[PDB]
Amino acid sequence: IPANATNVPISIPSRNWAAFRGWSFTRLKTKETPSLGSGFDPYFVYSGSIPYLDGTFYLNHTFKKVSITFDSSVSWPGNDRLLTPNEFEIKRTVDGEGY
Amino acid sequence: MATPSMLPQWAYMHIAGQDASEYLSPGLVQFARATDTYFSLGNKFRNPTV
């Protein structure tokens, strides 16, 4: 997705969940790996540390929120678990409630 | 919670079920215990935890 904040739609079909465990996520930067199973690509870039094949990450602080839902009308962190319950925030710029 | 209609998704082996030290044939349990100091066999089995 390119250029500017907020939300645009989808919904996605069909079946299968069970023995599901977390979600884990980080922000990367398009860097060294062109794709696995290839070599000498024009998609190949850089030569420094690869945070995709190393445990290095460094943009894991550039997140404002990460709403996780299901269906299209079910909100998974629902039941008022959190003090902002419809999304998990990660950082809050301008805090007035002391959260 | 867990309710009927969950059997087709189920058939789980080494995701759920009895522990690693009980899956095995009883003779390989004994062999493993005696020799696990020079020759491991503990990581060759996956232990379900539910």
Partner: peptide, 20 residues
């Protein structure tokens, strides 16, 4: 979270009757 669990099962370092 994370997964991957594995489990392992007098003097003198051995003695056993482990057979088929």
């Amino acid at each position: 979270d994370i997964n991957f669990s594995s489990l392992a099962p007098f003097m003198g370092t051995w003695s056993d009757i482990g057979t088929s």
